[PDB]
Amino acid sequence: GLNALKKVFQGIHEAIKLINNHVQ
């Protein structure tokens, strides 16, 4: 819901996703 939950959620998510998708 809240901008908090979304923020963290997209944070670590996109973070691990960019690194993983970049180094792939």
UniProtKB/Swiss-Prot annotation:
Superkingdom per UniProt: Eukaryota
Key words, A-Z: Amphibian defense peptide, Antibiotic, Antimicrobial, Cytolysis, Fungicide, Hemolysis, Immunity, Innate immunity, Secreted
GO annotation, biological process: defense response to bacterium; defense response to fungus; innate immune response; killing of cells of another organism; xenobiotic metabolic process
UniProt cross-references to InterPro entries, sorted A to Z: Antimicrobial_19
GO CC annotations on file: extracellular region
Keyword Lipid biosynthesis: no
Tissue specificity statement from the Swiss-Prot or TrEMBL entry: Expressed by the skin glands.
Compartments where found: Secreted
Function: Antimicrobial peptide with activity against fungus (C.albicans) and Gram-positive and Gram-negative bacteria (S.aureus and E.coli). Also has low hemolytic activity against human erythrocytes.
Sequence similarity: Belongs to the frog skin active peptide (FSAP) family. Pseudin subfamily.
Designated name of the protein: Pseudin-2
